[PDB]
Structure 1
């Protein structure tokens, strides 16, 4: 309570994100000897992630989550993190952010231009596609009214596989699916579980199309005001929570398919070759729009070996 701080997020109280944010909050309170208390504001109470990023910049929110890909809003080449099928796995996502010149520069700009400090990175699952009718092949996407978040890379995913995208906020999705205003949505399995989308979607297709990370972000206005020993408490707690965050996602990912089958969901495994083929002209458009910066980021990312060594 010397520092009453706030951590906003789109995820809800049943989510892995929230569980790991609770761990972070508990560690910070303990190790700051009570000087800092972090309260959680889930379910987009404060707005969406675009809004919460603005609040961190302004200093009116202290902590939030965002993907590396979400920074495409300021630096177009950062969409590389969510070009479908480009990032192979989380090992690549980690090296793309921390071990490339592109990623290192992005982190610096976040701090210097956007007033946000990157404390840690976790894995947030690989997106799959749920729907009210089977997706047995890419043909089934044609005219599927597929909800997407308000993000260019997801809108593109939907466009290029032949679906009819409808952007809407995460908070509005469950109702849209339940009323069949849309036919499907796409998110990692842990979100399908957390938001109970499986109650209102009969089918799950393993499209494996976009890999999400999650960054623990702090407003510079807040971080700069903490004495350095408290900065260290926050940084160390964010790193500890991110490892736990990743583990919740990794441990659950395979098992969740069983969980959904038991809830009555039918699982399909469409041939992904035509999905990946369909993205070829999108990668071309990305390079055309983002220029040499985008080409360079793609090359640095494609150079990363996806196997742990």
Structure 2
């Protein structure tokens, strides 16, 4: 095609993220009258999300996904998006990004500092905890060897509940679980399904600890080279895809629980009050480390009403 573009991602071909990227690619090809063709590179072929963000910045990759929280690597106050139990629901996540002074500033900085344009935001599930032994209460977390991604907020979740965190890349998790090199991991239900972690974990606990969004990002180097009519095609297709992406996750959360039960997984519902209590010193550490910028972001987010 005139524009042979590439979209990289961490998740595999069975995932909701891939299905939504496929819809995006199909709509762009149709509505651009074949001028743009997007190829998909799943399963971390091009690196992890940190590496792929760098590739958008330098113009060697055209599209990728990221969470709003991942920008904590550049702007420490953006950790607020993944402080455990702070963001209640997806309504709050949307308004935090688009309808606060903090969020609007972050969108501007992505463009000016990092060379990436935000096209759309979707819901990517609420993270839960799987393990090789039952989690009936906070006591069962003590000493659990919990895999986490290479992200400070996930590491903190594990440390503050008393687990022993082990950071590793997403591609390595299935084998670590299979060999019991680690005792468990944490991810939304959809990822547990897509990666088949239910084959190698007997238990699922509804810890509801971190809510993930998903941003459709384009490299400025690519976006700038498109004529404005094709920029519009891309933007409109990203907003349509994000609607579909969100629907996939919202529908799955309804009934994936019964799918896992049919596969032999036992589901627990630990009392979350001690889990939430255990995070209080972490919120304090966050404010100490990020100062008034972090305090302000927290206050803007805590002000948002979660009811539509």
How high is the TM-score relative to the length of structure 2? 1.00
Deviation at 1:70, TM superposition (A): 0.3
CA distance in 1, matches of 2:303, 2:38: 39
Deviation at 1:141, TM superposition (A): 0.3
The aligned residue for residue 193 of structure 2 is 193
Deviation at 1:234, TM superposition (A): 0.2
Q: What are the superposed Cα offsets for residues 204-229 of structure 1, whole Å, 9 maximum, x if unpaired?
A: 00000000000000000000000000
- Number of equivalences: 308
CA distance in 1, matches of 2:138, 2:6: 43
Gaps of 5+ in 2: none
Deviation at 1:275, TM superposition (A): 0.2
Deviation at 1:296, TM superposition (A): 0.3
Deviation at 1:66, TM superposition (A): 0.2
The aligned residue for residue 264 of structure 1 is 264
| Residues 224-263 of structure 1 mapped to structure 2, 5 A cutoff | 224-263=224-263
Deviation at 1:197, TM superposition (A): 0.3
Deviation at 1:200, TM superposition (A): 0.3
Deviation at 1:254, TM superposition (A): 2.0
Deviation at 1:40, TM superposition (A): 0.3
CA distance in 2, matches of 1:160, 1:12: 31
Deviation at 1:263, TM superposition (A): 0.3
CA distance in 1, matches of 2:298, 2:12: 33
Deviation at 1:303, TM superposition (A): 0.2
Structural RMSD (CA) = 0.4
The aligned residue for residue 29 of structure 2 is 29
Give the match's secondary structure for 1:133: coil
Deviation at 1:174, TM superposition (A): 0.3
CA distance in 2, matches of 1:44, 1:9: 6
CA distance in 1, matches of 2:225, 2:139: 55
Are 1:50 and 2:50 an aligned pair? Answer: yes
CA distance in 2, matches of 1:225, 1:58: 14
CA distance in 2, matches of 1:297, 1:172: 34
CA distance in 2, matches of 1:29, 1:298: 41
CA distance in 2, matches of 1:176, 1:24: 33
Give the match's secondary structure for 1:146: strand
Give the match's secondary structure for 1:53: helix
CA distance in 2, matches of 1:275, 1:56: 37
How high is the TM-score relative to the length of structure 1? 0.99
The aligned residue for residue 72 of structure 2 is 72
Q: What are the superposed Cα offsets for residues 101-153 of structure 1, whole Å, 9 maximum, x if unpaired?
A: 00000000000000000000000000000000000000000000000000000
Gaps of 5+ in 1: none
Give the match's secondary structure for 1:113: helix
Q: What are the superposed Cα offsets for residues 73-106 of structure 1, whole Å, 9 maximum, x if unpaired?
A: 0000000000000000000000000000000000
Are 1:289 and 2:279 an aligned pair? Answer: no
The aligned residue for residue 182 of structure 1 is 182
Q: What are the superposed Cα offsets for residues 236-284 of structure 1, whole Å, 9 maximum, x if unpaired?
A: 0000000000000000102000000000000000000000000000000
Runs of 4+ in 1 over 6 A off after TM superposition: none
Q: What are the superposed Cα offsets for residues 33-54 of structure 1, whole Å, 9 maximum, x if unpaired?
A: 0000000000000000000000
Q: What are the superposed Cα offsets for residues 145-164 of structure 1, whole Å, 9 maximum, x if unpaired?
A: 00000000000000000000
CA distance in 2, matches of 1:269, 1:112: 44
